[PDB]
Design a protein around this ligand. Structure first.
Ligand SMILES: N=C(N)NCCC[C@H](NC(=O)[C@H](Cc1ccccc1)NC(=O)[C@H](N)Cc1ccccc1)C(=O)CCl
Ligand SMILES: *CC(=O)[C@H](CCCNC(=N)N)NC(=O)[C@H](Cc1ccccc1)NC(=O)[C@H](N)Cc1ccccc1
Lengths: 305, 304
């Protein structure tokens, strides 16, 4: 029983983390086979970040200016390239602890485990959701860049996020491992503000199913509704619209509990309009939306890797 | 910026988790050097658990009955002993991946990271607090006994918990790595109920400090309360008493915040009586008590 915000085992990623230094700037990198990936603003001065010509400043440097270090071992850079906002440094040695991996671009609403690192050393791991505004509400301090987010798809480590920048709101923004930013953000010190956020309704429903699997039933009424009557209510509370594909993905939890998706949509409807009656659900007094439907199955089914 | 309940990196512990099978019963074990630790009731059948006698039940068994698996490699068991409620299995080979480790017994109120495992394979990692009633509100399914909790002191993995049992409440109970249960629980199918629980006052305060460092300051007030007076409001609301040892350990965050421990005790005291004013604190409408004062520094000081 029980239900906690659960991260994937971080062992396979810990083995790929290294330190990348260029001039006076250091940050983290991901060492897979004989290539190290890291944010390309490692090659930038603070002066450069006001208007950075990454194409020009990349070729102005060469392999010797990059100091990659895997723990205590120095790795010899033998080639440097640029794929969007991610700098690829070819190295002399291939990582023996390289897992079977894949580079994936997640969609807003999905989750992943973040391994926060500093100077190429892991500090801690936690679960993050990619908000609808393409930010993540993470925990990062300076030097955390190159920290990556990932999922473990059965026998494969799917990397989905590399951290680049903190915004003024305190939220965070990054890229996929192809170097493409999630959201309308820039690796440039220019005015950037996240867009208005919304609540991932499909994830909240999944989290109510999880509460039912763990005994909590006080919020379940004898009502049901239509998918559009609920969405009318959802829009009023700045909730993401629920699609038919969303209802499809909640089937497995609807099947496990014997509660139709729209039956619980009605339960959520009245949780939004009349509050939570000063009661707790899985140890929270607010509606949690950082659990995907697969996150609930994974935790309440004992999936292993 | 930001504050989430993050766990320690699990890599070092992952290498130590194996699958222990005796008869029809399979659970997880910890493989350190040439020894595999696991909950002793692996030797029992469900019919035995109603009134097991472990010393005689081990009298019945041999090293031949204990099957250990490190991934897909089978480890030869060459000896089996028992220390309190933990079974120690001596094996033919030592774990190449044994970290510098300690066995520690935590006190109620401190936190640790749990690596939930099944069939010797890790499934997830999360943070827990040892409640004042010596329970933990974790996430454990069947075949999760053997899973272990741990901290990471720089480069020393100090194990402090092994999972053994879930109680009717839904909470969880286990032992330190010397086989001694936390709380008045036992590995037997007997009437056992978790004592009624209290909130960890010192952790809530640390959590409030984390909230202001991260920018949340609406709960502030500072009406000048005394340690005692606070404690008398606290105990009525089922919060554990706040000693001045606690005040001492909140010193660091009282410093960086410039907020005297007692003046936040004040703003906690009326948060306790008035309410949350329908507002949040780091994304919670509840007072969070599963963050130690060190947990708050470690997460605000970038420790690795
Ligand atoms: N995949 C599985 N399930 N393999 C078999 C391993 C069984 C193993 N143990 C168990 O499942 C233990 C056995 C136990 C232990 C201590 C006291 C009394 C009974 N079962 C339990 O703890 C049950 N909650 C039974 C229970 C209810 C109420 C109070 C106490 C115990 C496990 O899950 C840990
Ligand atoms: C991940 C990092 O911390 C990295 C600094 C590495 C050097 N190591 C240490 N200082 N210990 N990068 C940044 O800190 C990042 C650089 C950047 C600037 C502009 C865009 C993208 C990246 N700095 C920030 O993100 C600041 N918050 C500046 C900023 C950026 C965007 C909007 C508003 C402010």
């Amino acid at each position: 029983s029980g239900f906690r915000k659960m991260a994937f085992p971080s062992g396979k990623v810990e083995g790929c983390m290294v330190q990348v230094t260029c001039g006076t700037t250091t940050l983290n990198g991901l060492w897979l086979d004989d290539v190290v990936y890291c944010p390309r603003h490692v090659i930038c001065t603070s002066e450069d970040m006001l208007n950075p010509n990454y194409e020009d400043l990349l070729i102005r440097k060469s392999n010797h200016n990059f100091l990659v270090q895997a723990g205590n071992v120095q790795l010899r850079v033998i080639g440097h390239s640029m794929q969007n906002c991610v700098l690829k440094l070819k190295v002399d040695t291939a990582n023996p602890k390289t897992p079977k991996y894949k580079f994936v671009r997640i969609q807003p609403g999905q989750t992943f485990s973040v391994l926060a690192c500093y100077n190429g050393s892991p500090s801690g791991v936690y679960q993050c959701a990619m908000r609808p505004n393409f930010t993540i509400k993470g925990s990062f301090l300076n030097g955390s860049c190159g920290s990556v987010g990932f999922n473990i798809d059965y026998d494969c480590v799917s990397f989905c996020y590399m951290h680049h920048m903190e915004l003024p709101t305190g939220v965070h923004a990054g890229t996929d491992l192809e170097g493409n930013f999630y959201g309308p953000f820039v690796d440039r010190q220019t005015a950037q503000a996240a867009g208005t956020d919304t609540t991932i309704t499909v994830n909240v429903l999944a989290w109510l199913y999880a509460a039912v699997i763990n005994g909590d039933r006080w919020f379940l009424n004898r009502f049901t509704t239509t998918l559009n009557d609920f969405n009318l209510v959802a829009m009023k509370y700045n909730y993401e619209p629920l699609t038919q594909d969303h209802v499809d993905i909640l089937g497995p939890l609807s099947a496990q509990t014997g509660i139709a998706v729209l039956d619980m949509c009605a339960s959520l409807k009245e949780l939004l309009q009349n509050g939570m009656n000063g009661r707790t659900i899985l140890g929270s007094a607010l509606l949690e939306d950082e659990f995907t439907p697969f996150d609930v199955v994974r935790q309440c089914s004992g999936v292993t890797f």
